[PDB]
Amino acid sequence: AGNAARDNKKTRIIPRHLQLAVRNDEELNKLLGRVTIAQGGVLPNIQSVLLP
Amino acid sequence: AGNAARDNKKTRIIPRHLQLAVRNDEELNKLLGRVTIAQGGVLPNIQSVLLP
Amino acid sequence: LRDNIQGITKPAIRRLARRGGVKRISGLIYEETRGVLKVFLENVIRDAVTYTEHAKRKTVTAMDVVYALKRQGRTLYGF
Amino acid sequence: LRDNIQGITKPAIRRLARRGGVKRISGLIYEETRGVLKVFLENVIRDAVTYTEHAKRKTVTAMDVVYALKRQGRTLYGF
Amino acid sequence: RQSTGKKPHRYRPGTVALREIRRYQKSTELLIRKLPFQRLVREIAQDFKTDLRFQSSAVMALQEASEAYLVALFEDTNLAAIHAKRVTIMPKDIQLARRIRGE
Amino acid sequence: KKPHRYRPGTVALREIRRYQKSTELLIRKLPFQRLVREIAQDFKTDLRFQSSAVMALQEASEAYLVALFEDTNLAAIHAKRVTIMPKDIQLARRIRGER
Amino acid sequence: GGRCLAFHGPLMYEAHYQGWKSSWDEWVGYDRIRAYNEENIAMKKRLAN
DNA sequence: CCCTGGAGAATCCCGGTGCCGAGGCCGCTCAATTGGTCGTAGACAGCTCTAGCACCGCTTAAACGCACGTACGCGCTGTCCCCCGCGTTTTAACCGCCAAGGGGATTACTCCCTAGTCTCCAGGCACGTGTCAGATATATACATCCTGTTCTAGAGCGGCCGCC
DNA sequence: GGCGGCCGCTCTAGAACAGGATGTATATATCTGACACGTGCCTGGAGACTAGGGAGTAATCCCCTTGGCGGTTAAAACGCGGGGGACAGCGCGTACGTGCGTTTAAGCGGTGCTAGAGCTGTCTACGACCAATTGAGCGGCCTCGGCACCGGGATTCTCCAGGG
């Protein structure tokens, strides 16, 4: 979460940083696959065929 | 299961009949959705577009 | 309270699909999404109602909602 | 013991898809099904190995596999 | 009862949709409004038990859980749409995703 | 004479009707058992398996693969197809959360 | 024995016709010849007549 | 029809406010820590014996492979109607603000039935066994699917007839 | 006398229909193998008793959600323009359906042996429990600073128009 906050260059840890920390790590993704995180959203990924 | 066994002309309860009884009832199918039944198979249902 | 299923507006469902990375949104997805949300709420709120009735309380707390989400494999953090 | 992933033969996968009501079965889906089965076995058998190691036993019983499948929401009856 | 009754911009579809996808995917705030969802929750709860109240935080938790569940369902629906060689989602894709999920 | 020459699909429907009502195990016992042994060899070299343990593993794997094939076929019919594809399996695993 | 032995026009009879089901075998004893499998089954049935 | 130069608008980096939630501090008190003391679950040693590992006959249904073709996967075209971007005018959302009154939270008096024994006994479990429904077996028999032959409808062609 | 229009004739093909094909639905014959009844226990729950403790209920309290407003600017909704895409349709093809030849191992039955899980003692540290204590976790208050907000400016990627 601190690494994700530094990528966003924020000092305080917000729930977006925690959600990014959980979803970015594959081990944490498998551990918390059935886990819903409030105020966090999802990963900002775009499918390959979506871009024109 | 006895109803399914009478539908199969059987007077002994076999795990196929138990699987049919579980999956035929909607409440039992929803309750036992995460349930694996040994020697039971699945329902003999075929899709509409699969018929010739 | 009647016709409260239309409170979830069409651009709200559009924004929810935008969060999910949906390219194009059909006009028939809104009624189906409202029905799916109604079914999910009719499960979760009923489970929370049973949780509240068990504890002899008249209003439902967020902890009972957390328990009702956790028992179906959809655990929620932060409440 | 090597190359036992080919032990799940082509007509076995054919029969497995016929049980599931599949009309047409591709030629490239056998390897994918073998990989999916390998992943599922590498989860379940590893869980049973941990159960047997905690159970002070060197033989994997059916009961250990039963709760190994139960802990992942895939409970099996009859063993 | 007693009554008788010069050139505009003209953005093509898809680019602004991807712009909104990028804006809301990196965003944090709640998309669904508060009081319509709360009123829907009360209307659903009144069918099961009358004279029932919900606190603000319980409504908040329900709203965030429903938003996350619907976002995951829309992700699966879009994945099935690209899987079906399409960019437009259909309600049958939602039904297929619910059937695969087991609900 | 000429052969009967069944059209593609009729024997498929016959096999679907036969296996959807029969509870016999489609996977052969010994190859699945030996696959289980080499998979468990990566975790424990000195390990043994009971026969009923292999039976339970075979039944659970068969049911999981049959459910995966059902989801794959339904996704194929959703995608204007009748032939199951590996990408349909990947989609079914991703929706179920196992991918 | 052999690969072609039939009283009529042979279809690679094995002592059973290959490529056919089991309910077509006849074991009668008559005058059997080969003739290069009735000249390659009449040169592929008159080149697929 | 494709490549390249110029500009409209959503988006990104940055200067200044400040503010309201985050960080640090004061007690202190209630949960965390220390020592002893037993019942007791657990670590360890010897027996065993019933189920699993390895190899062997064999035979036979299961499986690899090659020949052929027709349902279906995939590439390509249009279109039109379904959805999106934006102008405009309603429309209810959120914060601002006020009481209310059921209702969560806390404290205390009391009371039944649940923790824990004693004894036993009648329902539950291990073992033995007659038995009654399921499976193997096979001619007979369904049973629908595939295919060959014929029926009838449709379009093309040619002969006949009236008109200029 | 030449030609357009009309009607009969023959060609062609879609499709209803009947016959052959092969894998199952049944009708006994008989094996057979667990199914349930009986018996003999015997091991766990029930009658009865002792004691006590956590909730049922009453009271308080203070707290927090519902109703209920104006306001105001974000946005739902209606509608016009239009635009790119879902799907019907058509064509290419290849690659997967169907079928047996042939090989090849799956499985039934058998035999030997030890790998090791229950089983029974045995002895031993270990954790719940009772005095005795004690020290920073947390409610709350003081302080403070990171980024929401508000604009200002800007690079910066994107669409429209001109040229080859």
Coordinates of N, CA, C and O (backbone and C1' of nucleotides) in Angstrom, one line a residue, chain I residues 55-133:
Chain I
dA55 P -25.9 -14.5 28.5 O5' -27.5 -14.2 28.3 C5' -28.3 -15.3 27.9 C4' -29.7 -15.1 28.7 C3' -30.5 -13.9 28.3 O3' -31.9 -14.3 28.4 C1' -30.1 -13.8 30.6
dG56 P -33.0 -13.7 27.3 O5' -34.4 -14.0 28.0 C5' -34.4 -14.4 29.4 C4' -35.7 -14.0 30.0 C3' -36.5 -12.9 29.4 O3' -37.8 -12.9 29.8 C1' -35.4 -12.1 31.3
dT57 P -38.9 -11.7 29.2 O5' -38.8 -10.6 30.3 C5' -39.0 -10.9 31.7 C4' -38.7 -9.7 32.6 C3' -39.2 -8.3 32.1 O3' -40.0 -7.7 33.1 C1' -37.0 -8.1 32.7
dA58 P -41.0 -6.5 32.7 O5' -40.3 -5.2 33.5 C5' -40.1 -5.3 34.9 C4' -39.1 -4.3 35.4 C3' -39.4 -2.8 34.9 O3' -39.6 -1.9 36.0 C1' -37.1 -3.4 34.6
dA59 P -40.2 -0.5 35.7 O5' -38.9 0.5 35.6 C5' -38.0 0.4 36.7 C4' -36.7 1.2 36.3 C3' -36.9 2.5 35.6 O3' -36.4 3.6 36.4 C1' -35.1 1.1 34.6
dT60 P -36.6 5.1 35.8 O5' -35.2 5.4 35.1 C5' -34.0 5.1 35.8 C4' -32.8 5.4 35.0 C3' -32.8 6.7 34.2 O3' -31.5 7.3 34.2 C1' -32.4 4.9 32.7
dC61 P -31.3 8.8 34.0 O5' -29.8 8.9 33.3 C5' -29.3 7.7 32.7 C4' -28.8 8.0 31.3 C3' -29.3 9.3 30.7 O3' -28.4 9.8 29.7 C1' -30.1 7.7 29.4
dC62 P -27.2 10.8 30.1 O5' -26.1 10.6 28.9 C5' -26.1 9.3 28.3 C4' -26.4 9.4 26.8 C3' -26.5 10.8 26.3 O3' -25.9 11.1 25.0 C1' -28.5 9.6 25.8
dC63 P -24.9 10.0 24.2 O5' -25.9 8.8 23.7 C5' -25.4 7.8 22.9 C4' -26.2 7.7 21.6 C3' -25.8 8.7 20.5 O3' -26.1 8.2 19.2 C1' -28.1 9.1 21.1
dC64 P -25.0 7.4 18.4 O5' -25.8 6.6 17.3 C5' -27.2 6.3 17.6 C4' -28.1 6.7 16.4 C3' -27.4 7.6 15.4 O3' -28.1 7.5 14.2 C1' -29.1 8.8 16.4
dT65 P -27.7 6.5 13.0 O5' -29.0 6.1 12.3 C5' -30.0 5.4 13.1 C4' -31.4 5.8 12.7 C3' -31.7 6.2 11.3 O3' -33.0 5.8 10.9 C1' -32.2 8.0 12.7
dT66 P -33.5 5.8 9.4 O5' -34.8 6.7 9.4 C5' -35.8 6.4 10.4 C4' -36.9 7.5 10.4 C3' -37.2 8.1 9.0 O3' -38.6 8.1 8.8 C1' -36.7 9.8 10.5
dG67 P -39.3 8.5 7.4 O5' -39.9 9.9 7.7 C5' -40.7 10.1 8.9 C4' -40.9 11.6 9.2 C3' -41.2 12.5 8.1 O3' -42.3 13.4 8.4 C1' -39.4 13.4 9.2
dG68 P -43.2 14.0 7.3 O5' -42.6 15.5 7.2 C5' -42.1 16.2 8.3 C4' -41.3 17.4 7.8 C3' -41.4 17.7 6.3 O3' -42.0 18.9 6.1 C1' -39.2 17.9 7.1
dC69 P -42.6 19.2 4.6 O5' -41.4 19.7 3.7 C5' -41.2 21.1 3.4 C4' -40.3 21.8 4.4 C3' -39.4 22.9 3.9 O3' -40.1 24.1 4.0 C1' -38.2 21.5 5.4
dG70 P -40.6 24.9 2.7 O5' -39.2 25.0 1.8 C5' -39.0 26.1 0.9 C4' -37.8 26.9 1.4 C3' -36.9 27.3 0.2 O3' -36.1 28.4 0.6 C1' -35.8 25.8 1.5
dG71 P -35.6 29.5 -0.4 O5' -34.2 28.9 -1.0 C5' -33.2 28.3 0.0 C4' -31.8 28.2 -0.7 C3' -31.8 28.5 -2.2 O3' -30.4 28.9 -2.5 C1' -31.4 26.2 -1.8
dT72 P -30.1 29.8 -3.8 O5' -28.7 29.3 -4.2 C5' -28.0 28.3 -3.4 C4' -27.4 27.2 -4.3 C3' -27.6 27.4 -5.8 O3' -26.5 27.0 -6.5 C1' -28.6 25.4 -5.2
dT73 P -25.7 27.9 -7.5 O5' -24.6 27.0 -8.2 C5' -23.8 26.1 -7.5 C4' -24.1 24.7 -7.7 C3' -23.8 24.2 -9.2 O3' -23.2 22.9 -9.1 C1' -26.0 23.7 -8.6
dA74 P -22.1 22.4 -10.2 O5' -22.3 20.8 -10.3 C5' -22.0 20.0 -9.2 C4' -22.7 18.7 -9.3 C3' -22.6 17.9 -10.7 O3' -22.5 16.5 -10.5 C1' -24.9 18.4 -10.3
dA75 P -22.2 15.5 -11.7 O5' -23.7 15.1 -12.1 C5' -24.6 14.5 -11.1 C4' -26.0 14.3 -11.6 C3' -26.1 13.7 -13.0 O3' -27.1 12.7 -13.0 C1' -27.3 15.6 -13.0
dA76 P -26.9 11.3 -13.6 O5' -28.4 10.8 -13.9 C5' -29.3 10.6 -12.8 C4' -30.8 10.9 -13.1 C3' -31.3 10.2 -14.4 O3' -32.7 9.8 -14.2 C1' -31.4 12.6 -14.7
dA77 P -33.4 8.9 -15.3 O5' -34.0 9.9 -16.3 C5' -35.1 10.8 -15.9 C4' -35.5 11.6 -17.1 C3' -35.7 10.9 -18.4 O3' -36.9 11.3 -19.0 C1' -34.3 12.8 -18.7
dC78 P -37.6 10.4 -20.2 O5' -37.8 11.4 -21.4 C5' -38.3 12.7 -21.1 C4' -38.1 13.7 -22.3 C3' -38.2 13.0 -23.7 O3' -39.0 13.8 -24.6 C1' -36.2 14.2 -23.5
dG79 P -39.4 13.2 -26.0 O5' -38.3 13.8 -27.0 C5' -38.1 15.2 -27.0 C4' -36.9 15.5 -27.9 C3' -36.7 14.7 -29.2 O3' -36.4 15.6 -30.2 C1' -34.7 14.7 -28.0
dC80 P -36.8 15.2 -31.7 O5' -35.5 15.7 -32.6 C5' -34.9 17.0 -32.3 C4' -33.5 17.1 -32.8 C3' -33.3 16.3 -34.1 O3' -32.4 17.1 -35.0 C1' -31.8 15.5 -32.4
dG81 P -32.1 16.6 -36.5 O5' -30.7 16.0 -36.4 C5' -29.7 16.8 -35.7 C4' -28.3 16.2 -35.9 C3' -28.1 15.3 -37.1 O3' -26.7 15.5 -37.6 C1' -27.8 13.9 -35.2
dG82 P -26.2 14.9 -39.0 O5' -25.4 13.6 -38.5 C5' -24.6 13.7 -37.3 C4' -24.2 12.3 -36.9 C3' -24.0 11.3 -38.0 O3' -22.9 10.4 -37.6 C1' -25.5 10.4 -36.4
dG83 P -21.4 10.8 -38.1 O5' -20.5 10.1 -36.9 C5' -21.2 9.6 -35.7 C4' -20.8 8.2 -35.4 C3' -20.2 7.4 -36.6 O3' -19.4 6.3 -36.1 C1' -22.3 6.5 -36.2
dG84 P -17.9 6.2 -36.5 O5' -17.5 4.8 -35.8 C5' -17.7 4.5 -34.4 C4' -18.7 3.4 -34.3 C3' -18.2 2.0 -34.8 O3' -18.6 1.0 -33.9 C1' -20.2 2.6 -35.8
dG85 P -17.6 0.0 -33.2 O5' -18.5 -1.3 -32.8 C5' -19.7 -1.1 -32.1 C4' -20.8 -2.1 -32.5 C3' -20.4 -3.4 -33.1 O3' -21.3 -4.4 -32.8 C1' -21.6 -2.4 -34.7
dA86 P -21.1 -5.4 -31.6 O5' -22.5 -6.2 -31.4 C5' -23.7 -5.4 -31.4 C4' -25.0 -6.3 -31.7 C3' -24.8 -7.8 -31.7 O3' -26.0 -8.4 -31.4 C1' -25.1 -6.9 -34.0
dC87 P -26.2 -10.0 -31.5 O5' -26.7 -10.2 -33.0 C5' -27.9 -9.4 -33.5 C4' -28.1 -9.7 -35.0 C3' -28.0 -11.1 -35.5 O3' -29.1 -11.4 -36.3 C1' -26.7 -9.7 -36.8
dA88 P -29.6 -12.9 -36.5 O5' -30.0 -13.0 -38.0 C5' -30.9 -12.1 -38.6 C4' -30.7 -11.9 -40.1 C3' -30.5 -13.2 -40.9 O3' -31.3 -13.2 -42.0 C1' -28.7 -11.8 -41.2
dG89 P -31.5 -14.5 -42.9 O5' -30.3 -14.5 -44.0 C5' -30.1 -13.3 -44.7 C4' -28.8 -13.3 -45.5 C3' -28.4 -14.7 -46.0 O3' -28.5 -14.7 -47.4 C1' -26.5 -13.6 -45.0
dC90 P -28.2 -16.0 -48.3 O5' -26.7 -16.0 -48.6 C5' -26.1 -14.8 -49.2 C4' -24.7 -14.9 -49.5 C3' -24.2 -16.3 -50.0 O3' -23.3 -16.2 -51.1 C1' -22.9 -15.6 -48.1
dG91 P -22.9 -17.4 -52.0 O5' -21.4 -17.7 -51.6 C5' -20.4 -16.7 -51.9 C4' -19.1 -16.9 -51.2 C3' -18.5 -18.3 -51.4 O3' -17.1 -18.1 -51.7 C1' -18.7 -17.8 -49.1
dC92 P -16.2 -19.3 -52.3 O5' -15.2 -19.7 -51.2 C5' -14.3 -18.7 -50.8 C4' -13.4 -19.2 -49.7 C3' -12.8 -20.6 -49.9 O3' -11.4 -20.6 -49.5 C1' -14.0 -20.5 -47.8
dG93 P -10.5 -21.9 -49.9 O5' -10.4 -22.7 -48.5 C5' -10.1 -22.0 -47.3 C4' -10.3 -22.9 -46.1 C3' -10.0 -24.4 -46.3 O3' -9.3 -24.9 -45.2 C1' -12.2 -24.2 -45.5
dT94 P -7.7 -25.0 -45.1 O5' -7.4 -24.9 -43.5 C5' -8.4 -24.3 -42.6 C4' -9.1 -25.4 -41.8 C3' -8.3 -26.6 -41.5 O3' -8.5 -27.0 -40.1 C1' -10.3 -27.2 -42.6
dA95 P -7.6 -26.5 -39.0 O5' -8.5 -26.5 -37.7 C5' -10.0 -26.4 -37.9 C4' -10.6 -27.8 -37.5 C3' -9.6 -28.8 -37.0 O3' -10.3 -29.6 -36.0 C1' -10.7 -29.7 -38.8
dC96 P -10.6 -29.0 -34.5 O5' -12.2 -28.6 -34.7 C5' -13.1 -29.3 -33.9 C4' -13.8 -30.4 -34.6 C3' -13.9 -31.8 -33.9 O3' -15.3 -32.2 -33.8 C1' -13.2 -32.1 -36.1
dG97 P -15.8 -33.2 -32.7 O5' -16.8 -34.1 -33.4 C5' -18.1 -33.6 -33.7 C4' -18.8 -34.5 -34.8 C3' -18.9 -36.0 -34.4 O3' -20.2 -36.5 -34.8 C1' -17.6 -35.8 -36.4
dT98 P -20.7 -37.9 -34.2 O5' -20.2 -39.0 -35.2 C5' -20.6 -38.9 -36.6 C4' -20.1 -40.1 -37.4 C3' -19.9 -41.4 -36.6 O3' -20.6 -42.5 -37.3 C1' -17.9 -40.9 -37.8
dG99 P -20.7 -43.9 -36.7 O5' -19.5 -44.7 -37.3 C5' -19.4 -44.8 -38.8 C4' -18.2 -45.6 -39.2 C3' -17.8 -46.8 -38.3 O3' -17.5 -47.9 -39.2 C1' -16.0 -45.4 -38.4
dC100 P -18.3 -49.3 -39.1 O5' -17.2 -50.4 -39.3 C5' -16.2 -50.6 -38.2 C4' -14.8 -50.5 -38.8 C3' -13.9 -51.6 -38.2 O3' -13.0 -52.0 -39.3 C1' -13.1 -49.4 -37.7
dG101 P -12.2 -53.4 -39.1 O5' -10.6 -53.0 -39.0 C5' -9.9 -52.7 -40.2 C4' -8.4 -52.4 -40.0 C3' -7.7 -53.5 -39.2 O3' -6.3 -53.6 -39.7 C1' -7.7 -51.6 -37.9
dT102 P -5.4 -54.8 -39.1 O5' -4.7 -54.1 -37.8 C5' -4.1 -52.8 -38.0 C4' -3.5 -52.3 -36.6 C3' -3.0 -53.4 -35.7 O3' -1.8 -52.9 -35.1 C1' -4.6 -52.2 -34.5
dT103 P -0.7 -54.0 -34.5 O5' -0.2 -53.3 -33.1 C5' 0.0 -51.9 -33.1 C4' -0.5 -51.2 -31.9 C3' 0.1 -51.8 -30.6 O3' 0.3 -50.7 -29.6 C1' -2.3 -51.9 -30.5
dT104 P 1.5 -50.7 -28.6 O5' 1.1 -49.6 -27.5 C5' -0.2 -49.1 -27.5 C4' -0.9 -49.4 -26.2 C3' -0.1 -50.3 -25.2 O3' -0.4 -49.9 -23.9 C1' -2.1 -51.3 -25.6
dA105 P 0.8 -49.2 -23.0 O5' 0.0 -48.9 -21.6 C5' -1.2 -48.0 -21.6 C4' -2.4 -48.7 -21.0 C3' -2.2 -49.4 -19.6 O3' -3.4 -49.2 -18.9 C1' -3.0 -51.0 -21.1
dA106 P -3.7 -48.0 -17.9 O5' -5.3 -48.0 -17.7 C5' -6.1 -48.7 -18.7 C4' -7.4 -49.1 -18.1 C3' -7.5 -49.1 -16.5 O3' -8.8 -49.0 -16.1 C1' -7.3 -51.3 -17.4
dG107 P -9.2 -49.1 -14.5 O5' -9.6 -50.6 -14.3 C5' -10.6 -51.2 -15.1 C4' -10.7 -52.7 -14.9 C3' -10.6 -53.2 -13.4 O3' -11.6 -54.2 -13.2 C1' -9.0 -54.3 -14.7
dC108 P -12.3 -54.4 -11.8 O5' -12.4 -55.9 -11.7 C5' -12.8 -56.7 -12.8 C4' -12.3 -58.1 -12.7 C3' -12.2 -58.7 -11.3 O3' -12.8 -59.9 -11.2 C1' -10.2 -59.0 -12.4
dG109 P -13.1 -60.6 -9.7 O5' -11.8 -61.5 -9.5 C5' -11.5 -62.6 -10.3 C4' -10.1 -63.2 -10.1 C3' -9.8 -63.4 -8.6 O3' -9.5 -64.7 -8.3 C1' -8.0 -62.3 -9.7
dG110 P -9.2 -65.3 -6.8 O5' -7.7 -65.2 -6.7 C5' -6.9 -65.9 -7.7 C4' -5.4 -65.8 -7.5 C3' -5.0 -65.8 -6.0 O3' -4.2 -66.9 -5.7 C1' -3.9 -64.0 -7.2
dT111 P -3.8 -67.3 -4.2 O5' -2.4 -66.7 -4.0 C5' -1.3 -66.9 -4.9 C4' -0.1 -66.1 -4.5 C3' 0.2 -66.0 -3.0 O3' 1.5 -66.5 -2.7 C1' 0.3 -63.9 -4.0
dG112 P 1.9 -66.8 -1.2 O5' 2.9 -65.6 -0.8 C5' 4.1 -65.5 -1.6 C4' 4.7 -64.1 -1.3 C3' 4.9 -63.7 0.2 O3' 6.3 -63.2 0.4 C1' 3.8 -62.0 -1.0
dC113 P 6.9 -63.2 1.8 O5' 7.4 -61.7 2.0 C5' 7.1 -60.8 1.0 C4' 7.3 -59.3 1.5 C3' 7.5 -59.2 3.0 O3' 8.2 -58.0 3.3 C1' 5.4 -58.3 2.3
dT114 P 9.2 -58.0 4.5 O5' 9.3 -56.5 4.9 C5' 9.4 -55.5 3.9 C4' 8.2 -54.5 4.0 C3' 8.1 -53.7 5.3 O3' 7.9 -52.3 5.0 C1' 6.1 -54.7 4.8
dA115 P 9.1 -51.3 5.0 O5' 8.4 -49.9 4.7 C5' 7.4 -49.8 3.7 C4' 6.3 -48.8 4.0 C3' 6.5 -48.1 5.4 O3' 6.0 -46.8 5.3 C1' 4.5 -49.3 5.4
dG116 P 6.1 -45.8 6.5 O5' 4.7 -46.0 7.3 C5' 3.4 -45.9 6.6 C4' 2.3 -46.3 7.5 C3' 2.2 -45.8 8.9 O3' 0.9 -45.5 9.3 C1' 2.2 -48.1 9.0
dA117 P 0.4 -44.0 9.6 O5' -1.1 -44.2 10.2 C5' -2.1 -44.7 9.3 C4' -3.3 -45.4 10.1 C3' -3.8 -44.7 11.3 O3' -5.2 -45.0 11.5 C1' -2.7 -46.8 11.9
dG118 P -6.1 -44.0 12.3 O5' -6.9 -45.0 13.3 C5' -6.1 -45.6 14.3 C4' -6.8 -47.0 14.7 C3' -7.2 -47.1 16.1 O3' -8.2 -48.2 16.2 C1' -5.3 -48.4 15.8
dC119 P -9.1 -48.3 17.5 O5' -8.1 -49.0 18.6 C5' -7.7 -50.3 18.4 C4' -6.8 -50.8 19.5 C3' -7.0 -50.1 20.9 O3' -7.4 -51.1 21.9 C1' -4.7 -50.2 20.4
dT120 P -7.8 -50.7 23.4 O5' -6.4 -50.9 24.2 C5' -5.7 -52.1 24.2 C4' -4.4 -52.0 25.0 C3' -4.6 -51.3 26.4 O3' -4.0 -52.1 27.4 C1' -2.8 -50.3 25.1
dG121 P -4.6 -52.1 28.9 O5' -3.3 -51.7 29.8 C5' -2.7 -50.4 29.7 C4' -1.2 -50.5 29.7 C3' -0.5 -49.7 30.8 O3' 0.7 -50.3 31.1 C1' 0.1 -48.8 28.7
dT122 P 1.4 -50.0 32.6 O5' 2.2 -48.6 32.3 C5' 3.3 -48.6 31.4 C4' 4.0 -47.3 31.3 C3' 3.8 -46.4 32.6 O3' 5.0 -45.7 32.9 C1' 3.2 -45.2 30.8
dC123 P 5.3 -45.1 34.3 O5' 6.7 -44.4 34.2 C5' 7.1 -43.9 32.9 C4' 6.8 -42.5 32.7 C3' 6.6 -41.6 33.9 O3' 7.8 -40.8 34.2 C1' 4.9 -41.1 32.3
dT124 P 7.8 -39.2 33.9 O5' 7.4 -39.0 32.4 C5' 8.1 -38.2 31.5 C4' 7.3 -36.9 31.2 C3' 7.4 -35.8 32.3 O3' 7.7 -34.6 31.7 C1' 5.2 -36.2 31.8
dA125 P 8.6 -33.5 32.5 O5' 8.1 -32.1 31.9 C5' 8.3 -31.7 30.6 C4' 7.1 -31.4 29.8 C3' 6.5 -30.0 30.0 O3' 5.8 -29.6 28.8 C1' 5.0 -31.5 30.8
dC126 P 5.5 -28.1 28.4 O5' 4.2 -28.2 27.6 C5' 3.2 -29.1 27.9 C4' 1.8 -28.5 27.9 C3' 1.8 -27.0 28.2 O3' 0.5 -26.5 27.8 C1' 0.9 -28.1 30.1
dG127 P 0.5 -25.0 27.0 O5' -1.0 -24.6 27.2 C5' -2.1 -25.5 27.0 C4' -3.2 -25.4 28.1 C3' -3.6 -24.0 28.4 O3' -5.0 -24.0 28.7 C1' -2.9 -25.0 30.3
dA128 P -5.9 -22.6 28.5 O5' -7.0 -22.7 29.7 C5' -8.0 -23.8 29.7 C4' -8.6 -24.0 31.0 C3' -9.2 -22.8 31.7 O3' -10.3 -23.1 32.5 C1' -7.4 -23.6 33.0
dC129 P -11.2 -22.0 33.2 O5' -10.6 -21.9 34.6 C5' -10.5 -23.1 35.4 C4' -9.9 -22.8 36.8 C3' -10.2 -21.4 37.4 O3' -10.6 -21.5 38.7 C1' -7.9 -21.7 37.4
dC130 P -11.4 -20.3 39.5 O5' -10.3 -19.9 40.6 C5' -9.8 -20.8 41.5 C4' -8.7 -20.2 42.4 C3' -8.9 -18.8 42.9 O3' -8.6 -18.7 44.3 C1' -6.8 -18.9 41.7
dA131 P -8.8 -17.4 45.1 O5' -7.4 -16.7 45.1 C5' -7.1 -15.7 46.1 C4' -5.6 -15.5 46.2 C3' -5.1 -14.0 46.3 O3' -4.0 -13.9 47.1 C1' -4.2 -15.0 44.3
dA132 P -3.7 -12.6 47.9 O5' -2.2 -12.2 47.4 C5' -1.6 -12.8 46.3 C4' -1.1 -11.8 45.3 C3' -1.6 -10.3 45.5 O3' -0.5 -9.5 45.9 C1' -1.6 -11.0 43.2
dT133 P -0.7 -7.9 45.9 O5' -0.2 -7.4 44.4 C5' 1.0 -8.0 43.9 C4' 1.1 -7.7 42.4 C3' 1.1 -6.3 42.0 O3' 2.2 -6.0 41.1 C1' -0.4 -7.5 40.7

